[PDB]
Amino acid sequence: KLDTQLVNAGRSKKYTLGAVNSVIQRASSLVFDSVEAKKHATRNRANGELFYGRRGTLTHFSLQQAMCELEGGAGCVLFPCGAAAVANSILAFIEQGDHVLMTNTAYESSQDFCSKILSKLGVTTSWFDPLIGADIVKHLQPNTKIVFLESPGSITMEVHDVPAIVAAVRSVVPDAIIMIDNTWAAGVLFKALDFGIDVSIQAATKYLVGHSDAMIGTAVCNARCWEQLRENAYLMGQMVDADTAYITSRGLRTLGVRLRQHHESSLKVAEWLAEHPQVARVNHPALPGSKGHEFWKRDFTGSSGLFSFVLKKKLNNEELANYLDNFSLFSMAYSWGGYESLILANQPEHIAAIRPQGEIDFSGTLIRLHIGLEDVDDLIADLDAGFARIV
Amino acid sequence: KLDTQLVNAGRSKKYTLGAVNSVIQRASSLVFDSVEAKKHATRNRANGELFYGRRGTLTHFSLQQAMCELEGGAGCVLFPCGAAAVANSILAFIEQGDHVLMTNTAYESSQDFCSKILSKLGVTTSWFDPLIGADIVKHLQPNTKIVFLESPGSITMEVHDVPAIVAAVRSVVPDAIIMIDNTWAAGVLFKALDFGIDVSIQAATKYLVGHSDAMIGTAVCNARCWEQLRENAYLMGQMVDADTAYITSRGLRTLGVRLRQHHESSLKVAEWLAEHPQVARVNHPALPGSKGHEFWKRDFTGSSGLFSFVLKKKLNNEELANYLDNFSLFSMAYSWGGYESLILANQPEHIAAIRPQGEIDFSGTLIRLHIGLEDVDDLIADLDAGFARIV
Amino acid sequence: KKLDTQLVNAGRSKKYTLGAVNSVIQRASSLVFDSVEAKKHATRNRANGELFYGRRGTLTHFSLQQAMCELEGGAGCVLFPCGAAAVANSILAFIEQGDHVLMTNTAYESSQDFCSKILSKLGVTTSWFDPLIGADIVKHLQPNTKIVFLESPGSITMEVHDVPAIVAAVRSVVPDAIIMIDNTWAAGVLFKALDFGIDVSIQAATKYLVGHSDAMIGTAVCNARCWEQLRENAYLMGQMVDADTAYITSRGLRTLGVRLRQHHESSLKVAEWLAEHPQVARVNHPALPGSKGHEFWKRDFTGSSGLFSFVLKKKLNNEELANYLDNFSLFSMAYSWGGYESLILANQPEHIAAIRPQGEIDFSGTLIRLHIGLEDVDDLIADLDAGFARIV
Amino acid sequence: KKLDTQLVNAGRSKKYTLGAVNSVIQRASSLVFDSVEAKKHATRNRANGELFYGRRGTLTHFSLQQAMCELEGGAGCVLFPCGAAAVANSILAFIEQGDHVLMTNTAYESSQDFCSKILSKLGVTTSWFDPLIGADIVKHLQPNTKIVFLESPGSITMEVHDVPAIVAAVRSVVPDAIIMIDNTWAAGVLFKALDFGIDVSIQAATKYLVGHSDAMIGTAVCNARCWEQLRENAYLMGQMVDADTAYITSRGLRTLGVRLRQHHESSLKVAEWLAEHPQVARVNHPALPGSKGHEFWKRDFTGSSGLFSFVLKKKLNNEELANYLDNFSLFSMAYSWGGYESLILANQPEHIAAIRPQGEIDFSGTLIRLHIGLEDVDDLIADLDAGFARIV
């Protein structure tokens, strides 16, 4: 049923108004036809009636309903990008004197927000190894307010044991807000809310948009946490533009066909890399032997196309340029979840800089690949010519 | 020269690329053609080179340059709406233990952010009368970090004596960040940065967009404050979409012709209202006798079209509906700065609720009008039929 | 009925705005029918503003159409992907093999080229008339004349027709002619074409209606007589415009009054200064006394836009042309006009003679066409004066 | 040269992407010339991908054009505001009074109506041929035949032409005919029309290329022989598409492979189930053995899309039609197709007979046209089965 759900999510007649897709209603001012109507809108301003463009128009309401259907949420809060969704969802639940506990494989800008912004506000952050499972209880404090997960991890791809973590957290600090950056799974390949997580956050920028051309963050909330996240992010003025909301809704339509290709291609590339003379290790959650692969197999319903691998060699600057500068099909850029395949290098000392209170376990240059929609054998051919440049 | 500046601001060839207007470059991923190029982009990521869509594309850079030219700034920071610009510009400069001092006529969501969000983060806020001038020194504390102005004030339209306030603040707390919500002036009718203000904030949603169909906040900074505001708002993921940046740039083009009509019409309406049997008081900065009109005349180069007036009567609910429900040309909606004229009522007890540490001085129903681009005599006719419904 | 109030409200019915101030943007090809009964009703009303199929329009197009009918006083508004398509397709909609088309020799060049290169091979002939022919247009009418095509002011040279004289004269000889006008310069609104007994008023909405040089679109506002035939025959040619452009055209209407008043005030001040300037031979501005057809403009228009031309005393050689045009600071060279910025183009007398069929030109200096935008008028005059000093 | 890699990269030259992954969106009418020399160079290259005037395109259009030339193997790509405009205007670009047009009687109805209602009054005649005529097309050729217009598979009834036989036969009699095909169903890519000696491959990019039912646009990819004439004559009619739609069409290309593979796999599974169903008389799916021209599809196409039809054993009366169509849960009624969602439409045999000129129909039950979208195929089959139970 995921394919049927994606096609239809949010496409109620009150939003589509005779069209297949939702209307695009651009607005700040929304007009009240009478004092009575304005009183009704005001009462329902956070309940999907037209009130003011900062709260949404019909376009936003459509995306919101779609995201709640897909991720099994009580509400969906919108932001101008994923980093805004992370920073503001955390902010929405903290106060001076709180502790935040975050996986050390969190997205770097997520870590930065905590280390550079929260620290000045009387909020301390500490870190954990993504494979800690039930042993996370050692890191919990009486003042732990947020436990922030990201599975798989940024760059290095470690999958958490979310069931174990959640049961441990609920046993010790049941008031904690458990959040996950669920971007890799595009919210649909891991049903975070069904595992007891309070908030599922995505850079909708990535697979939901699908084409590398719009930025948008989403936070789907359970009933417990929706009101606080919604109202407190509203107080920070968080919203996304109507057109971007429309394009996000539109990305959902092809999300199933895209994610099946990303899975099929990326796993075939991971398998080929794993057997290559020049590769030390492959980090792909769907690949047997990868860190937390067992948790991927048990808890996810698919894979996307982002993964990494580690070269046997630590490339020097000359070698790095010869490798990365001469790809035919892979491009160097940040982000991912688009239709085109991307490549970035990360030296071991770079990654060690962004694993606080943890330790690196590789020594070669780490390559992160986003496997897009191009013919997989063409991509493999491009990677092999790559290896020949650095043998 | 303002008209020539508006027409040309930001329209460098590197952004327009053969067209009259800037290109619309939609992107998250921005591609690096080599390792050397990526190192160059990285070094210049906050200096107008293409790096990642969260920092901007050519479209954003164009708007940024335009806003810096118009408002005489070192940099322009972008946000998803005005309320986001206010909340995040304040957040960018505070830490636990700070004091914020804000005019009691600040926009209500500005006050709310301080009372509901900052309070939990160890930051206290207090308030001042907008006409306080040099006497503001009584409100300054050793830990005052931000002095937040809004001139004219929201709803009630009081104009500050900005020179007096700034000299007083610099004499007592020279480290304070002085910010102003300069939306009414559309940043161009009051050159805030030239008066020693550190940050000029706008709901670009209002007159810069001009058509009530896009939401966007801007903060133009002096050289002292730009880096901190830019980097700290980036850490909160603040940005606006490319298309909205384009539409903002595009609004600037007609801003002079619009604002001259808004001034001409709104002042003629204010003059007519001032002489009407049913009106107690008119609050329009351009109208002699209005609170701080002298400061308007000395410090501004024009007026926009938003003002208010107070009825002799405090309308009951029946009367409120008869009045507001039967307008032909005025519409009820929030926001303003568009092409169409708007009307809202505010009872005295409502306004008293949002003037902290201050006192109301009127007793009749307050009407706020946005005077748009319609024939002024048609608007006056609509207001007079209005008066006849409540005599 | 005051233009400014009309511009602000035109098309913004609740059924199209749906709670916002502007019309919604409804992007669609497919439009869904909830039942066979609904499908049947939509089919009947497919040319009557019911949702049927995106080629016929969505709510966004219907909004613009209503606005254009209101503003120009028409029974309907047909939409096209640019102004040239509106012209070409509006003429095509009414002709058949064996017809003749009578067109002002001041017509936009692409309109002339459509007649001479397309219509000719379809058995349709074209001839041309001087824009100041007036009542004497009777001399050019044939038994097979189907269309009389006006453009006032003229392209480039700005001659204003005596429309009342032309129209009364055509109707006295060929009452059932389709009279059309390319009314782009007046933005449909400074000259109410349909009130003068013209059947079809065509614009390049590309120009003033959009107002920012960033969208292309053509409109044809038609009387009740001609609406069905234009609409249906244009539809058979697949003519439509995208919903987003329709929205931006509706949105342009909102500032069209404040923009046109600035373009008039500035362009007339420029024109008056140019008339006095010793390097200028003549100024062609409808609003400036002495211009061809000024007295007709005075009588028949309720305002001016910002496009006009002037003729230099010199015929510039190539080196002087370059030195003049290449070094402007505020004026830019580009085609189109009707935007917020000022443009400049040169035309040599021999270039204009080549697009003035069956007629002669009336100047021998280099002609400069100006679009006066929204910049400070004294800055623009300073840029023009610096230009003069480069070709003394 | 693998389709998937081509789709991802087509048109994304650095000069159009300017640092991003997708082409920039350059909205413009005016395009600025920095000097007289630049203006002169832009003028020369105005049909060669230099910025000249928005009616000719911006960088965004040039990107799409390059992508379409690459994908269909053409020398150029002409753009139009919808598919119907592409058809109408591509035919117009090549005809003149006295010509004859030979068109498949399975042609999209609007294409037939253009010929019968527009072309007829311009001295151009049209006749029609059965889509399975093959080599016997020679029987319909006249000395004045200028165009032979193919559509394969056929609209609604889905008959596949033997294109190699038709084309060899036309060239043996009228070598200088312009042969065109409406190649919308194959999305330009499952049938490489230009490799079969067809001159012009036309699509309603509206359908599969856009892929989301929210933009309208037509394309005509032309060989070197025919490109200039199509381009220039289409331009004289003002044909263009907006930059934003061009961008969304380029963007549609990126997922066209993954979408078409799902539409094929799902629609064939549906077709196979329908063939077996006791309330179904026949299935018209190019990929299903037994369908008209299947063996030609097998030989000539590299895949299928998701549009096909089937004929019920019953001719539904009006009450049964309603009960059937009105109560679907996943299929929607709407025109167009090629999007992500599934659509259903009914056509009675007498309705199809009326749009099958110079030929007869081959069925007597109600015909149902299906577009199979991206929904779960077993959900769609369950909705169809519930439909069958409503008309047993």
Author numbering:
A (entry chain A), B (entry chain A): 5 to 395
C (entry chain B), D (entry chain B): 4 to 395
Authors' text:
In this study, we have addressed these questions by focusing on the two PLP-dependent enzymes alanine racemase (ALR) and cystathionine β-lyase (CBL). E. coli CBL is a homotetramer that catalyzes the formation of l-homocysteine from l-cystathionine. We have demonstrated that two non-homologous specialized enzymes from E. coli are as little as one mutation away from being physiologically relevant replacements for each other.
To test our hypothesis, we solved the unliganded and l-Ala-P-bound structures of CBL(P113S). To our surprise, the mutation did not significantly affect the position of Tyr-111 in the unliganded structure. All of these interactions remain in the CBL(P113S) structure. In the mutant, nitrogen atom NH1 of Arg-58′ is now within hydrogen bonding distance of the Ser-113 side chain (N-O distance of 3.3 Å). The relevant side chain pKa values were estimated using PROPKA 3.1 (40). This analysis suggested that the introduction of the P113S mutation lowered the side chain pKa values of both Tyr-111 (ΔpKa = −3.2) and Arg-58′ (ΔpKa = −5.5). This is likely due to the new hydrogen bond between Ser-113 and Arg-58′ lowering the pKa of the latter and establishing a proton relay. In contrast, CBL(P113S) showed a 6.5-fold increase in kcat, whereas its Km value for l-Ala was similar to CBL.
